[PDB]
Design a protein around this ligand. Structure first.
Ligand SMILES: O=C(Nc1ccc2c(c1)CNC2)c1cc(Br)cc2[nH]c(=O)[nH]c12
Lengths: 156, 38
């Protein structure tokens, strides 16, 4: 049904009431979310149905109706905006300067904001409004807080 | 069955709440897409 661009909540009725399991981005007729949010399952958009098209557990990403369309990258110097959509709460932009995840295969941007796991899939943006990645896959630091990677897929 | 609900537009907001730090962490990523500290 609804395929208008924007940020969307991923909900389920399998538990008690309606529970937000994650968030995603609709862009160019493709829904983009994190793999751990849906596990590759089909989603409903009103009367319509969205079927998985591409997915990868290691990258933690999944696209619906078509291939991954988001290809903006963090410039490594500028502040970004996590457009957080928390369970039961209104969408809200949080401006931060990302840190770094140093890995064996190079470095990744990292947003140091802690939100409930149901906020997984929320877009991270550059000054132009472009989606530079998704929030929801990272690590738990000594403090207890979460530090997520700026996870971006590949546009074929 | 999982379903989607619109939550808003994707736009940069001027004068947004500026918070959070910028840490440099040594991480490792396993085959299951899970990160850990080194
Ligand atoms: O657990 C989280 N993310 C996740 C879960 C399952 C998997 C992966 C990532 C990748 N492989 C499978 C998580 C996401 C957010 Br947002 C805030 C959190 N606070 C926490 O303590 N964990 C999380």
């Amino acid at each position: 049904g609804e395929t208008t661009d924007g940020v969307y909540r991923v909900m389920t009725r399998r538990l008690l009431g309606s529970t937000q399991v994650g968030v995603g981005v609709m862009q160019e007729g493709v829904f983009h979310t994190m793999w751990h949010v849906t596990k590759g399952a089909a989603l409903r958009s009103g009367e319509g149905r969205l079927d998985p098209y591409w997915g990868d557990v290691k990258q933690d990403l999944v696209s619906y109706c078509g291939p991954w369309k988001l290809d903006a990258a963090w410039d490594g110097l500028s502040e970004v905006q996590l457009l957080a959509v928390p369970p039961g709460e209104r969408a809200k932009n949080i401006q931060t300067l990302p840190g770094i995840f140093k890995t064996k295969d190079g470095d990744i941007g990292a947003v140091a904001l802690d939100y409930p796991a149901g906020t997984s899939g929320s877009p991270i943006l550059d000054k132009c409004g472009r989606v530079i990645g998704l929030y929801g896959n990272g690590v738990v630091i000594k403090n207890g807080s979460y530090v997520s990677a700026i996870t971006q897929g590949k546009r074929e | 069955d999982m379903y989607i609900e619109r939550a808003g537009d994707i736009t940069w907001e001027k004068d947004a709440e500026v918070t959070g730090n910028s840490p440099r962490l040594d991480v490792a990523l396993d085959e299951s897409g899970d990160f850990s500290l080194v």
